[PDB]
Write an enzyme that holds these catalytic residues in place. Structure first.
Site, PDB file in Angstrom:
ATOM      1  N   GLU A   1       0.796  -1.235   0.000  1.00 15.33           N
ATOM      2  CA  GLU A   1       0.000   0.000   0.000  1.00 15.33           C
ATOM      3  C   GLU A   1       0.832   1.291   0.000  1.00 15.33           C
ATOM      4  O   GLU A   1       0.543   2.236  -0.764  1.00 15.33           O
ATOM      5  CB  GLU A   1      -0.985   0.051   1.176  1.00 15.33           C
ATOM      6  CG  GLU A   1      -2.162  -0.943   1.125  1.00 15.33           C
ATOM      7  CD  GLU A   1      -2.640  -1.331  -0.278  1.00 15.33           C
ATOM      8  OE1 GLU A   1      -2.808  -0.466  -1.184  1.00 15.33           O
ATOM      9  OE2 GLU A   1      -2.883  -2.533  -0.454  1.00 15.33           O
TER      10      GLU A   1
ATOM     11  N   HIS B   1       2.215   2.367  -3.325  1.00 19.54           N
ATOM     12  CA  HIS B   1       1.285   3.134  -4.164  1.00 19.54           C
ATOM     13  C   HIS B   1       1.388   4.635  -3.952  1.00 19.54           C
ATOM     14  O   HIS B   1       1.187   5.396  -4.893  1.00 19.54           O
ATOM     15  CB  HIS B   1      -0.173   2.736  -3.939  1.00 19.54           C
ATOM     16  CG  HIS B   1      -0.576   1.485  -4.645  1.00 19.54           C
ATOM     17  ND1 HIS B   1      -0.430   1.319  -6.006  1.00 19.54           N
ATOM     18  CD2 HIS B   1      -1.110   0.331  -4.175  1.00 19.54           C
ATOM     19  CE1 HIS B   1      -0.867   0.118  -6.343  1.00 19.54           C
ATOM     20  NE2 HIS B   1      -1.273  -0.503  -5.250  1.00 19.54           N
TER      21      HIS B   1
HETATM   22  C1  MDB Z   1      -9.981 -10.760   1.843  1.00 20.61           C
HETATM   23  O1  MDB Z   1      -9.374 -11.350   0.691  1.00 20.61           O
HETATM   24  C2  MDB Z   1      -8.226 -12.083   0.832  1.00 20.61           C
HETATM   25  C3  MDB Z   1      -8.168 -13.119   1.773  1.00 20.61           C
HETATM   26  C4  MDB Z   1      -6.995 -13.865   1.918  1.00 20.61           C
HETATM   27  C5  MDB Z   1      -5.887 -13.565   1.126  1.00 20.61           C
HETATM   28  C6  MDB Z   1      -5.954 -12.529   0.188  1.00 20.61           C
HETATM   29  C7  MDB Z   1      -7.124 -11.784   0.038  1.00 20.61           C
HETATM   30  N1  MDB Z   1      -7.244 -10.766  -0.866  1.00 20.61           N
HETATM   31  C8  MDB Z   1      -6.321 -10.310  -1.713  1.00 20.61           C
HETATM   32  O2  MDB Z   1      -5.190 -10.768  -1.797  1.00 20.61           O
HETATM   33  N2  MDB Z   1      -6.728  -9.308  -2.489  1.00 20.61           N
HETATM   34  C9  MDB Z   1      -5.887  -8.628  -3.456  1.00 20.61           C
HETATM   35  C10 MDB Z   1      -5.777  -7.229  -2.886  1.00 20.61           C
HETATM   36  O3  MDB Z   1      -6.784  -6.753  -2.375  1.00 20.61           O
HETATM   37  N3  MDB Z   1      -4.627  -6.523  -2.908  1.00 20.61           N
HETATM   38  C11 MDB Z   1      -4.638  -5.181  -2.330  1.00 20.61           C
HETATM   39  C12 MDB Z   1      -4.258  -4.089  -3.318  1.00 20.61           C
HETATM   40  O4  MDB Z   1      -4.600  -4.111  -4.495  1.00 20.61           O
HETATM   41  N4  MDB Z   1      -3.538  -3.108  -2.787  1.00 20.61           N
HETATM   42  O5  MDB Z   1      -3.120  -2.007  -3.525  1.00 20.61           O
HETATM   43  C13 MDB Z   1      -3.331  -6.939  -3.464  1.00 20.61           C
HETATM   44  C14 MDB Z   1      -2.516  -7.655  -2.388  1.00 20.61           C
HETATM   45  C15 MDB Z   1      -1.345  -8.400  -3.033  1.00 20.61           C
HETATM   46  C16 MDB Z   1      -0.209  -8.397  -2.014  1.00 20.61           C
HETATM   47  C17 MDB Z   1      -0.574  -7.395  -0.931  1.00 20.61           C
HETATM   48  C18 MDB Z   1      -1.864  -6.709  -1.388  1.00 20.61           C
HETATM   49  C19 MDB Z   1      -6.463  -8.683  -4.880  1.00 20.61           C
HETATM   50  C20 MDB Z   1      -5.619  -7.847  -5.840  1.00 20.61           C
HETATM   51  C21 MDB Z   1      -6.445 -10.125  -5.393  1.00 20.61           C
HETATM   52  C22 MDB Z   1      -7.919  -8.215  -4.944  1.00 20.61           C
HETATM   53 ZN    ZN Z   2      -2.076  -2.595  -5.287  1.00 20.96          ZN
END
Ligand code: MDB
Ligand code: ZN
Length: 185
Positions: A155, A158
């Site tokens: 995060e 970004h």
């Molecule tokens: C509740 O859902 C879950 C439960 C257990 C494990 C993982 C997840 N969710 C996610 O990993 N979600 C990812 C996510 O929100 N992100 C956040 C983002 O886009 N931030 O800018 C990406 C992640 C990849 C590594 C760290 C953040 C996405 C890109 C696949 C939607």
């Molecule tokens: Zn991201």
């Protein structure tokens, strides 16, 4: 209610800008933005709401991803089984210290702003200490390790115009660094 249509796509200039520091206290609109960013994550984690509104289940969001160039993030990571969970809206977060030891998710990372998967390991600090303000301008200092450290680093990246795939080695994308910790979620 924020949905996928509010999430800008890789290629959008805002995602490569350096987001601006917030002045404290936050304006009313800034607080409402931060709360809605958290609410997007909440809604995305509700199976029924996420189905109804076509939401990808998210654990983090940075203001740049909704086209707002301000140093604000929301992180919502549910209980990993150990009773540890993370629900934070942070203002002006800064990594103030970190481990030399690295960590990585074994399958790489993804991003709400990136439609297609990119293969490759994203090495991050295994442990970080963050200082930030909360939505009311009070002080928060987090000590994080493993998965949540990875999420917060993703995060904060970004806010600096950095995308996860910037970290991927083009020659040996799947080769773990020596002594790097494999993190499972
Ligand atoms: C509740 O859902 C879950 C439960 C257990 C494990 C993982 C997840 N969710 C996610 O990993 N979600 C990812 C996510 O929100 N992100 C956040 C983002 O886009 N931030 O800018 C990406 C992640 C990849 C590594 C760290 C953040 C996405 C890109 C696949 C939607
Ligand atoms: Zn991201």
């Amino acid at each position: 209610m924020l949905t996928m249509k509010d999430i800008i796509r890789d290629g959008h200039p805002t995602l490569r800008q350096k987001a601006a520091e917030l002045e404290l206290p936050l304006t009313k609109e800034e607080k409402e933005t931060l709360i809605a960013m958290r609410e997007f994550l909440v809604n995305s984690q509700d199976e029924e709401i996420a189905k109804r509104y076509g939401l990808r289940s998210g654990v983090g969001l940075a203001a740049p991803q909704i086209n707002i160039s301000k140093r604000m993030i929301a992180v919502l990571i549910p209980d990993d089984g150990s009773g540890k969970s993370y629900d934070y809206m942070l203002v002006n977060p800064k990594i103030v210290s970190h481990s030399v030891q690295e960590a990585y998710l074994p399958t790489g990372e993804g991003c709400l702003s990136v439609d297609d998967n990119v293969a490759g390991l994203v090495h991050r600090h295994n442990r970080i200490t963050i200082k930030a303000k909360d939505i009311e301008g009070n002080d928060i200092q987090l000590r994080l390790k493993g998965y949540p450290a990875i999420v917060f680093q993703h995060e904060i990246d970004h806010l600096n115009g950095v995308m996860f795939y910037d970290h991927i080695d083009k020659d040996h994308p799947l080769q773990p660094h020596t002594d790097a910790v494999e993190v499972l979620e």
